[PDB]
Swiss-Prot record:
<keyword id="KW-1015">Disulfide bond</keyword>
<feature type="disulfide bond">
    <location>
        <begin position="55"/>
        <end position="105"/>
    </location>
</feature>
<dbReference type="GO" id="GO:0043022">
    <property type="term" value="F:ribosome binding"/>
</dbReference>
<dbReference type="GO" id="GO:0005507">
    <property type="term" value="F:copper ion binding"/>
</dbReference>
<dbReference type="GO" id="GO:0001556">
    <property type="term" value="P:oocyte maturation"/>
</dbReference>
<dbReference type="GO" id="GO:0005634">
    <property type="term" value="C:nucleus"/>
</dbReference>
<dbReference type="GO" id="GO:0001938">
    <property type="term" value="P:positive regulation of endothelial cell proliferation"/>
</dbReference>
<dbReference type="GO" id="GO:0007154">
    <property type="term" value="P:cell communication"/>
</dbReference>
<dbReference type="GO" id="GO:0016477">
    <property type="term" value="P:cell migration"/>
</dbReference>
<keyword id="KW-0963">Cytoplasm</keyword>
<keyword id="KW-0037">Angiogenesis</keyword>
<feature type="disulfide bond">
    <location>
        <begin position="37"/>
        <end position="90"/>
    </location>
</feature>
<dbReference type="GO" id="GO:0045087">
    <property type="term" value="P:innate immune response"/>
</dbReference>
<feature type="disulfide bond">
    <location>
        <begin position="24"/>
        <end position="79"/>
    </location>
</feature>
<dbReference type="GO" id="GO:0043066">
    <property type="term" value="P:negative regulation of apoptotic process"/>
</dbReference>
<dbReference type="GO" id="GO:0030139">
    <property type="term" value="C:endocytic vesicle"/>
</dbReference>
<dbReference type="GO" id="GO:0003779">
    <property type="term" value="F:actin binding"/>
</dbReference>
Amino acid sequence: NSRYTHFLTQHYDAKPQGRDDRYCESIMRRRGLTSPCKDINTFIHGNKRSIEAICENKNGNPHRENLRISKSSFQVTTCKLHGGSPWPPCQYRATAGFRNVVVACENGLPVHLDQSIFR
C-alpha cells in the first residue's frame, strides 16, 4: 500500500489554516513536489476516514473508465503553478474549494487523484 502512502503525501493535509498562495508554496516544497515544479496539485482536507470511504459505496460511485467519485463534499486546496519556469523557485496560486473528489482505488484505498476536475 505504498501507493496509498504516496496519495496521502501528495493529496492530503488534515488541518491547514491559510490556504493562500504562501500555503501552496510551502506545502508543495514540504511534500517534495517542486523538482520539477508540479503544474497543478490539489490537497484534500479533513479526516482520512472520509477519503478512504470513497472506495466503498458508503461514500463513492463508479466514475468513467477506472475511477470513483465521492458522494460527500471535501474542503480542498488547489495549487496552480505560474511564472513560466518549470524549475524552482515554484510560485503557486492557491484556489480553495469545497466539492466532491475523483480518485482511483486499489484494495479499498485511494491511490490516484484525478486533477482534471480542478483544472
